[PDB]
Design goal:
This is part of a larger assembly, with 7 protein chains of 7 kinds.
Chain B lengths: L6 E2 L41
Chain D lengths: L3 H17 L4 H22 L2 H25 L12 H22 L3 E3 L3 E3 L17 H11 L2 H21 L3
Antiparallel strand pairs in D: 1-2
Chain E lengths: L2 H35 L26
Classes of the chains: A mainly alpha (about 350), B little secondary structure (about 50), C mainly alpha (about 80), D mainly alpha (about 170), E mainly alpha (about 60), F mainly alpha (about 50), G mainly alpha (about 100).
GO molecular function (chain G): NADH dehydrogenase (ubiquinone) activity
Keywords (chain G): Electron transport, Membrane, Mitochondrion, Mitochondrion inner membrane, NAD, Respiratory chain, Translocase, Transmembrane, Transmembrane helix, Transport, Ubiquinone
GO biological process, one term (chain G): ATP synthesis coupled electron transport
Amino acid sequence: MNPIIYTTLIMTVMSGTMLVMISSHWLLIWIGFEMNLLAMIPVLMKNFNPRATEAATKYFLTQATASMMLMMAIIINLLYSGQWTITKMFNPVAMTMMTMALAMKLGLSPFHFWVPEVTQGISLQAGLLLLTWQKLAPLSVLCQISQSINPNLMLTMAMLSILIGGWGGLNQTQLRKIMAYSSIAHMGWMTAVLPYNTTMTILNLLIYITMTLAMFMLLIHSSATTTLSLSHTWNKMPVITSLMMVTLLSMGGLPPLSGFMPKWMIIQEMTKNESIIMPTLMAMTALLNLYFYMRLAYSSSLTMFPSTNNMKMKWQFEHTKQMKLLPTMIVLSTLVLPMTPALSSLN
Amino acid sequence: ELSKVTKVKTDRPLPENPYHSRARPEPNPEAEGDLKPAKHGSRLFFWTM
Amino acid sequence: GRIASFLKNAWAKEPVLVASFAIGGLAIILPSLSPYTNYAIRINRATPYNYPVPLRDDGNMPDVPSHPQDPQGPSLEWLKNL
Amino acid sequence: TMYIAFILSTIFVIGFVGFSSKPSPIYGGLGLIVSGGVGCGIVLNFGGSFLGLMVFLIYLGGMLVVFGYTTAMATEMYPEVWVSNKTVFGAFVSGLMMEFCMVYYALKEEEVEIIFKFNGLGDWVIYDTGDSGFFSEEAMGIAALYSYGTWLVIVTGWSLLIGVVVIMEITRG
Amino acid sequence: DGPEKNYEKTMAILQIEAEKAELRLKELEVRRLMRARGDGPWYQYPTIDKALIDHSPKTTPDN
Amino acid sequence: SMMKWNRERRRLQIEDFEARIALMPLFQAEKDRRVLQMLRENLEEEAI
Amino acid sequence: MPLVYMNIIMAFAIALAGLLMYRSHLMSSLLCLEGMMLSLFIMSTLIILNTHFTLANMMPIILLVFAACEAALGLSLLVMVSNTYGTDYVQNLNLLQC
């Protein structure tokens, strides 16, 4: 793909998300989602591969169904209210259908199935975009309609997302699939507090974005897609895998790392709303995410796997590409817990 | 010429409430006096500032 | 100079495209540089699609025409001349 | 002919069952052309002449014709009708039966409620008594897109152009 | 240092922490009331702006 | 030629619209009376 | 709601059911997806016309355009998949798992 064309497509994806976050008309939000899908498929298939084509097809099918259901819900709300503004939906059935569609766009379980497959099929850059930027628009729409969101349905979807993400991550060996299942679990965490406090969802989203950016960039820098390929990294660049260990521990949420902030604040808000069983189960299930993070950390840096003879040649050469944001992202995703009172800025 | 808006000097009183609208609800209290520093800052758990 | 040769070469080789660019270009520049565009707007506004809802005379509207056809009010004489 | 709109809507549902039974693509495409034509009829019955011809000219005329184009060039299927192998036949019959049950519960029982409330009264009631004069409400509003909806025009045009770009990038191999 | 120093410091710390606790409980109550009534500056979900409505003479007299 | 013809057509259209406007109040009066008459008849037969 | 609205919504539901329950050909799924777009067009058109939402008569057209764009996308993906595998069978899309 010509670089100019690629930049235009990336800007089109961004513009679709911006339209979703800028519009006050339901039709324009749906238009933004459609633009996102249209400009996302080629980005997913930048590197032409049969697996890439399969991932693109599955992604298109899921997002198309989601958009159909979203527009149907919009039309039903128009029928029962004669309103186009993105406010309190005035029809319960439309609300349910829209919730289903937006959850499918996010990847919340039981609409999680496509996320690991598509993530594995696409490249690490496309995976980064899919798991960070594509999560913004549906979350924005959900935040705007949080008042009308049925707490029971959303909580069920979020809890199932956490459970399924942990379980799936336990069994995976491919780094991309592990990242995808962890993303499912983190999206469950994000959407759990959506009915209660949207600002906490924004906080968790920002922390998740920083962590996933750091992790994906470290994977790209190490050019590893499997546990063993990442294991070989210690011989060449120990710094990268050690920083990966730190980021993985943050993703687990172990204090005093940044990952504790979102879980801590989420539990705070849920307990304020007299919900005690749900957050307890949420943390206890996030322990599984911690387990597969720890396994990856073991293989990567905490222990040393055998290497190959050809590594000697790679030792001589140095990485030419430089990801400018990576250091700042690592710092912001590891050491920011002393800065929780900055939560107010989000409000 | 027949399309020109014309004045009409009617004797029928102008309807006081043509839409027969109900009384509009009272607005919420609007703003307040000046802003002052938080009593103890961000009283978030252990943070003192 | 160099541009002039290019235009001659383009019309010699691909006259259809050269004409298309010229017609399209004029169809953009000429509208702004035309006085009848203002008239075209006025004609559209002049056309009375909907009824001219009368207003209640309050005694302090000299300009507004309180009559079928007298000097007060807008005039379509400009269109008649056109 | 007072219930013509209801008859058309039922035929619309029937065609939707026909193509939703996932038959041989060629037979399905027809199941969609028929339903599309019916839907255009319904829209015309409500007075949307321009929108009725829109689906006929674009959806049925172009969108479904390019769909048929693909089915014809990539033909790797054994032709079968909606009343063929039980996988399609049973689905078609069951869909028709569900629709007929809805119809009976809708006409015999005035206030039919499955997920939304429905009234068995003829749709002619919902029509509003009003005069537009020398106007085509549909046409005027749609033409207002160029005047009122400049933003919509911009976004839709950019989407179309980027769609051409995306199609080429995808189908370059 | 002298014991009285620690005594006064303890008194000050106790006052600060107790006032913080009072404010936290007060905030929780205020938030619940505002979210259950919508009569405060918080939880003011948007509504349609009346400025959009056009009151110009329409086509049909009965609006 | 088309410019002159179209301008004349616009003038004729304005004339026709003025005729419509002149006749509109009578039609509105008839319409409201007819609607109210039908409503009253429906009301009486509904009572019965 | 009038029975016509019920029928159109039921048509959308039926098309959605057909789309979600694949059989063999991915082409059939795309047909169901486009059918749903048609049903949404009809529903929105009727709603706008009845409400006399003059300024919103352009909504169905925009929906139609974007609908056919996303279809152009689906078809392009289908031919890529068919050229790679030989058929448009949904079962062929099996390399990616979980």
